[PDB]
Amino acid sequence: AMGSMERASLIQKAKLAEQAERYEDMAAFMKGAVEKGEELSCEERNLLSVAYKNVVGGQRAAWRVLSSIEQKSNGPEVREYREKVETELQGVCDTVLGLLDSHLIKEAGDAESRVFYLKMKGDYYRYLAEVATGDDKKRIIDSARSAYQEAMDISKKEMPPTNPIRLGLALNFSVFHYEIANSPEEAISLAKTTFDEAMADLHTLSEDSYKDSTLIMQLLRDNLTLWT
Amino acid sequence: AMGSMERASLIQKAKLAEQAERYEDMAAFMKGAVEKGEELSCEERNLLSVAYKNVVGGQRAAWRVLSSIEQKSNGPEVREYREKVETELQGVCDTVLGLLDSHLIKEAGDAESRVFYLKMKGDYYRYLAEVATGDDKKRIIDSARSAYQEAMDISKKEMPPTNPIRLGLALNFSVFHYEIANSPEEAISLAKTTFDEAMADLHTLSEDSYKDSTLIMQLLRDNLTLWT
Amino acid sequence: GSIPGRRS
Amino acid sequence: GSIPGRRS
Ligand SMILES: *Cc1ccc(S(=O)(=O)N2CCN(C)CC2)cc1
Ligand SMILES: *Cc1ccc(S(=O)(=O)N2CCN(C)CC2)cc1
Numbered sequence: 001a002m003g004s005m006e007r008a009s010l011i012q013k014a015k016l017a018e019q020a021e022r023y024e025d026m027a028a029f030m031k032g033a034v035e036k037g038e039e040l041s042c043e044e045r046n047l048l049s050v051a052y053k054n055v056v057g058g059q060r061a062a063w064r065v066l067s068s069i070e071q072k073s074n075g076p077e078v079r080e081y082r083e084k085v086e087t088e089l090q091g092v093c094d095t096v097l098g099l100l101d102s103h104l105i106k107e108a109g110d111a112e113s114r115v116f117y118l119k120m121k122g123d124y125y126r127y128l129a130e131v132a133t134g135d136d137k138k139r140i141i142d143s144a145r146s147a148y149q150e151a152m153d154i155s156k157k158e159m160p161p162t163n164p165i166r167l168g169l170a171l172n173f174s175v176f177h178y179e180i181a182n183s184p185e186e187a188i189s190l191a192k193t194t195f196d197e198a199m200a201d202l203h204t205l206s207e208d209s210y211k212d213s214t215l216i217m218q219l220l221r222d223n224l225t226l227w228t
Numbered sequence: 229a230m231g232s233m234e235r236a237s238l239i240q241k242a243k244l245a246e247q248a249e250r251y252e253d254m255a256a257f258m259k260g261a262v263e264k265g266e267e268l269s270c271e272e273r274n275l276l277s278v279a280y281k282n283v284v285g286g287q288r289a290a291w292r293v294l295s296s297i298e299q300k301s302n303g304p305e306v307r308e309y310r311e312k313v314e315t316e317l318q319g320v321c322d323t324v325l326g327l328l329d330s331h332l333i334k335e336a337g338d339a340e341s342r343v344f345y346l347k348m349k350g351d352y353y354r355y356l357a358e359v360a361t362g363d364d365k366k367r368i369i370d371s372a373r374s375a376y377q378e379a380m381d382i383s384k385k386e387m388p389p390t391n392p393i394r395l396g397l398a399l400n401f402s403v404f405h406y407e408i409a410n411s412p413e414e415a416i417s418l419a420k421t422t423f424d425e426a427m428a429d430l431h432t433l434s435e436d437s438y439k440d441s442t443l444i445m446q447l448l449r450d451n452l453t454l455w456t
Numbered sequence: 457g458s459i460p461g462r463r464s
Numbered sequence: 465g466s467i468p469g470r471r472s
């Protein structure tokens with residue numbers, strides 16, 4: 001618990017931890033900062049997101065290595081170790097989801113913060129769904145879908161089609177459709193419509209905003225190239 | 229503590245952890261395997277060494293990032309966080325040194341195992357010396373020197389000049405001289421003599437041994453190029 | 457690929 | 465550079 005460290009110090013240390021590539025530390029500092037109870041600024045939300053995407057990204061890559069070895073194998077060691085990594089990953093996803101539920105989402109009133117947190121909620125339920133096999137796997141998938149859908153509804157009402165958070169949300173929801181929901185046609189249609197509506201709005205942007213939006217558009221096009 | 233897991237299972241999981249790039253896990257499994265009390269085979273020594281070099285390698289890279297930021301800075305946060313990473317690094321080095329002292333070195337009777345463990349002992353005292361500033365920094369440097377020197381004496385009596393452990397020991401002792409002991413001339417002379425005596429022994433080797441030895445010779449030449 | 461999201 | 469020593 002980071003309860004004895006100042007909020008501003010936790011934020012400063014999270015930035016240092018990023019520079020040092022100490023992502024577990026970075027996540028613990030940002031968890032501490034959230035638990036101070038104040039809303040997060042745009043920059044602080046990004047730090048929270050980057051910390052946990054790196055932590056869970058390493059766990060997911062490890063889980064995929066071990067899952068592949070285990071599939072080829074079919075002693076208990078490979079399964080046991082895959083299970084250990086899986087439980088650790090589930091614990092990190094549950095931690096992030098807990099921060100969003102207590103109480104980041106309910107205090108997020110602006111569209112930019114609310115969309116950001118709901119996209120996170122969809123992503124972390126998606127990572128749970130990647131490893132799920134039991135009685136609640138359908139419910140996990142629906143929890144991801146519901147979070148992404150609420151984020152999409154807000155983003156289409158409140159943000160321009162080139163907004164980078166709106167674009168990244170659509171990208172990740174399209175990956176959800178393709179990889180989790182077994183809806184490749186929905187994934188392709190979402191990615192295409194998102195790309196085209198962004199293209200048509202680029203003329204409104206400054207040079208710096210243009211760079212930000214076109215970077216994510218390229219990720220949409222990369223997926224469309226792979227899927228079609 | 230890994231006391232309830234079988235030795236063979238710990239070894240198997242250390243190999244899986246390597247494939248999954250889970251080096252902290254890998255180190256904990258290999259620590260558990262050492263604590264079973266049996267000597268380690270050549271392969272098991274390599275697993276132990278690779279696990280801890282990755283763990284301490286990440287800590288050292290982080291410490292250098294933070295130390296550099298702290299030097300440029302001269303709030304307490306940068307120093308505090310550098311100190312936290314430093315203490316963690318010191319704890320890992322102390323853990324490795326403890327395994328070597330209890331009881332890997334004393335049970336190592338063959339030259340190949342004894343040289344391997346003494347080289348490790350020099351390396352981990354060297355990593356302690358990289359961060360040391362207090363009353364015992366000279367003693368830490370001398371502990372590294374003494375371990376490397378005993379390893380060198382055994383290796384010159386018992387191994388051919390192309391033996392990869394002998395070569396890597398000489399490489400790392402030359403780095404100790406250059407970077408820690410402020411003896412660049414000793415570092416250059418050790419690297420040159422090691423390279424030349426290895427060159428003269430390559431004719432005795434099979435194609436596979438030739439590849440193993442020449443790879444480390446290239447690291448010696450790379451340092452000589454940088455130092456001269 | 458999803459958003460890498462690994463660098464601030 | 466010392467021995468990388470990072471891969472078995
Ligand atoms: C989900 C998502 C992650 C990252 C981006 S971004 O890389 O465009 N960018 C991160 C930095 N902040 C300040 C702006 C957004 C977009 C979507
Ligand atoms: C200190 C040191 C580390 C690694 C080597 S090596 O890469 O040549 N090699 C590692 C694998 N084992 C089986 C042989 C040695 C040499 C020195």
Ligand SMILES: [Cl-]
Binds near residue numbers: 110
């Ligand atoms: Cl609010």
Ligand SMILES: [Cl-]
Binds near residue numbers: 336
């Ligand atoms: Cl023995």
